[PDB]
Amino acid sequence: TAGELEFVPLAANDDETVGQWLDLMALAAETGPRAAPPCNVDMVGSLRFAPPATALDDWVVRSGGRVVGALRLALPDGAPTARVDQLLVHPGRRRRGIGRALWAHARELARKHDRTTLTATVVESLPSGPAQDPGPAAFAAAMGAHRSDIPAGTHQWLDLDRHDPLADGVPAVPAGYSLVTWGTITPDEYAVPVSELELRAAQEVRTSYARQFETMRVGRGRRAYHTGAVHDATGALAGYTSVSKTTGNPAYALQGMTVVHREHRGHALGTLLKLANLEYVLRHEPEVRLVETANAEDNHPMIAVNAALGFEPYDRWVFWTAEAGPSD
């Protein structure tokens, strides 16, 4: 084992290592999937602000005193899994065993932390979209992982220079409803409704958990655009939608989920929300051209509604699991 590679914990206040890790990512992305390039604010931020009720176990591996690879695990409280958020080898040092060594490290950490399975997201090909590097899938299989049975993510791209869903402007707001907007922090009055929109003083635990996500994203320098639909006669939150923007990459943005309350369906609110919030976005983020989103592949309509707005299916986010295995 030892000699060639050194395992070192990745720590936010370690400027040099952190720097070499940002560079590794930058270098890797040049020959990785289609993606917004890593944002350094977002990435250094991901070392200071963890998601709620989640422990981060981050590592770097070195050859000759330099970072040649990285492993980040997310450990959700209570759960028996360890999510592999990053397992990355310098693109000029692949096929020497590093990945294998990182993966043995991941299992040893899962085991130590009382987790029985590792999960990962692996980029693969869509049945008829553009062929993707098969390496990461063959690595996964070779580590002993299996394709899980939860349906994969259909990962889509809208490109505003090839289609403008706003060509006819934003549609008419249906009678009885008004629109509202907010930024990175949910207004006090919609906190509870947002959190319940898709379902005592258990609301506080909920509201507080959501607030930790919102601050995580700000800590990571992300801006966010929300549009809400309100039912005037009841003042109920009928639906909302969002878009997330990293400090980096002025041309890129992330399209979030669109939610519409069960009792307010049938009024094209979903398309209204998407279109109106996009208008909102471009007004403050005029350089945005490339918007990404992802849906459960098994839900064709939601995907279709996105296609109608010009998002095209690009690549496939497949879920894998593996056993942490015995310590003994």
Ligand SMILES: CC(=O)SCCNC(=O)CCNC(=O)[C@H](O)C(C)(C)COP(=O)(O)OP(=O)(O)OC[C@H]1O[C@@H](n2cnc3c(N)ncnc32)[C@H](O)[C@@H]1OP(=O)(O)O
């Ligand atoms: C669950 C996961 O972690 S999936 C991987 C997620 N990470 C990424 O996609 C990030 C971008 N890619 C990378 O960093 C690298 O391509 C990754 C992580 C494979 C790193 O792998 P490396 O360090 O190059 O591979 P490594 O040398 O450790 O092991 C490869 C073993 O797995 C398989 N394997 C690894 N890469 C490949 C590949 N590109 N094509 C085919 N088989 C591969 C082979 O069986 C290989 O066996 P060995 O050479 O005798 O033949």
